[PDB]
Amino acid sequence: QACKKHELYVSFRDLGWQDWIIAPEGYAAYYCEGECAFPLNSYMNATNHAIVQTLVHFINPETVPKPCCAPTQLNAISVLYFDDSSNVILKKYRNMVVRACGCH
Amino acid sequence: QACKKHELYVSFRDLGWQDWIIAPEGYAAYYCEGECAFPLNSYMNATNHAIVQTLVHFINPETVPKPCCAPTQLNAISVLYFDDSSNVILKKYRNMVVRACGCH
Numbered sequence: 001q002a003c004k005k006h007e008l009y010v011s012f013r014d015l016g017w018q019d020w021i022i023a024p025e026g027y028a029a030y031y032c033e034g035e036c037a038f039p040l041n042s043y044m045n046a047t048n049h050a051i052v053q054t055l056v057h058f059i060n061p062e063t064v065p066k067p068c069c070a071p072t073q074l075n076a077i078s079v080l081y082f083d084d085s086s087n088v089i090l091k092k093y094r095n096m097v098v099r100a101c102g103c104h
Numbered sequence: 105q106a107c108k109k110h111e112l113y114v115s116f117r118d119l120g121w122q123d124w125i126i127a128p129e130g131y132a133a134y135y136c137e138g139e140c141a142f143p144l145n146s147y148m149n150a151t152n153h154a155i156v157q158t159l160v161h162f163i164n165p166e167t168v169p170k171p172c173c174a175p176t177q178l179n180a181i182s183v184l185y186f187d188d189s190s191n192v193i194l195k196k197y198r199n200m201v202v203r204a205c206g207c208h
């Protein structure tokens with residue numbers, strides 16, 4: 001239940017992009033989820049600011065929430081599609097995949 | 105109630121650091137909080153991955169949570185303190201202050 005990376009496959013059919021994409025038919029997108037509380041194991045990649053916020057939360061929970069589990073690194077995907085003039089084009093979409101998460 | 109930056113002053117006395125710090129007596133730390141849902145106004149600095157995750161959440165909420173509001177930029181502070189041999193030293197602590205937030 002601690003902050004970590006999870007699996008998530010995204011199908012272009014579910015989003016309604018199947019019409020003009022030639023390949024791939026979907027991709028492994030992943031997602032960050034879980035608690036950012038003590039112990040802030042090093043693997044959880046907390047910043048100094050997160051350590052401070054988690055301590056403040058411990059001292060008076062009304063003053064500030066716990067940090068949130070979020071992506072610390074992302075990578076692009078490339079898709080092959082047909083434009084409106086029937087051209088076949090390769091398009092790069094940046095920040096589409098989660099590679100690592102942390103309490104930031 | 106949307107994702108934005110908030111005020112948070114942190115006093116070294118509340119954390120028990122007053123013993124050896126010469127200056128300052130605390131600092132403006134800030135914190136990110138709020139919802140990451142449509143509309144993802146541009147000011148909310150969402151990544152492509154967050155847009156995709158928010159859409160997936162809209163299509164079946166059981167599959168994935170909404171993105172979380174987290175810091176996108178942080179700055180260091182410098183403190184003046186007395187070490188165990190009574191030396192006066194200037195120490196820099198990185199990633200201590202939140203400057204901007206987003207749905208990441």
Ligand SMILES: *[C@@H]1O[C@H](CO)[C@@H](O)[C@H](O)[C@H]1NC(C)=O
Nearest residue numbers: 003004005043044045100101
């Ligand atoms: C924290 O970052 C490192 C990158 O060195 C990564 O390998 C690790 O998986 C990250 N932790 C989590 C929980 O995603």
Ligand SMILES: *[C@@H]1O[C@H](CO)[C@@H](O)[C@H](O)[C@H]1NC(C)=O
Nearest residue numbers: 107108109147148149204205
């Ligand atoms: C999003 O990032 C920009 C930096 O260009 C920043 O000025 C803005 O305040 C950020 N938004 C929020 C809600 O913090």
